[PDB]
Amino acid sequence: XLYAXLX
Amino acid sequence: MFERFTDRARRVVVLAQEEARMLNHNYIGTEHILLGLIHEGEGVAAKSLESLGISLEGVRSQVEEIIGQGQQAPSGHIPFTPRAKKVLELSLREALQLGHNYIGTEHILLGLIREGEGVAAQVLVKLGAELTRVRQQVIQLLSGYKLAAALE
Ligand SMILES: [Cl-]
Ligand SMILES: [Cl-]
Ligand SMILES: [Cl-]
Ligand SMILES: [Cl-]
Ligand code: NA
Ligand code: NA
Ligand code: NA
Ligand code: NA
User: Fold this and answer.
1) At the topology level of CATH, where does B1-152 sit?
2) What is the DSSP letter of B23?
3) Within 10 A of B104 (CB to CB), how many other CB atoms are there?
4) Which of these, B37, B1, B6, lies nearest to B146 by C-alpha position?
5) B147 at A interface, C-beta within 8 A
6) Mutate to test the interface with A, among B85, B93, B108 (most CBs of A within 10 A)
7) Hey, is the C-beta of B151 within 8 angstroms of any chain A C-beta?
């Protein structure tokens, strides 16, 4: 969170 | 925040990334969030979209016709578009405004509708699911079997 995937 | 996402809502994000990859797209946009919601298949969001006649293959076809298939499949994580980030932030806002302590597929779709201006929104309208109707279908499921399940 909040970039890509579950990040 | 992803810590508050249900397991199913986390799967939506993972599937959104797979859907972007299969289309050879280098960002996960709202259109891929939409594909992930449908692909997940079992939550409130998937049920609401199916009830309005929206299908996985129809959305995939529209994305290919609107954006175009990309040229090489990306590797690694695929970054969110700015609008997809806004939609995921709005999913948290939608849950908070309803008084909820979790983020489910319902809230991702509510956030997508609330933003209302990207490729997913364009595709939904073109395929016959007005945004206000998508929202209504979601809320009706929340008021029905989801509330029933919580009371039991
Ligand atoms: Cl998080
Ligand atoms: Cl299909
Ligand atoms: Cl959920
Ligand atoms: Cl959109
Ligand atoms: Na949107
Ligand atoms: Na319009
Ligand atoms: Na219609
Ligand atoms: Na209509």
Assistant:
1) Double Clp-N motif (1.10.1780)
2) T
3) 23
4) B6
5) no
6) B85
7) no
Residue B147 Cα distances to A6, B110, B130, B140, B141, angstroms: 28, 17, 25, 10, 8
The two three-digit tokens of residue B72, written as one number: 């090489």
Ligand 7 centroid, distance to B128 Cα (angstroms): 4
Name the method of structure determination: X-ray
Both tokens of residue B152? 């039991």
- Can you give the residue ranges of every domain in chain B? 1-152
* Burial classification of residue B27, based on how many CB atoms lie within 10 Å of its CB (0-12 exposed, 13-18 middle, 19 or more buried): middle
Residue B101 carries which side chain, given as an amino acid letter? N
Ligand 8 centroid to residue B63 C-alpha, Å = 21
What's chain A's Rg over C-alpha atoms?
4
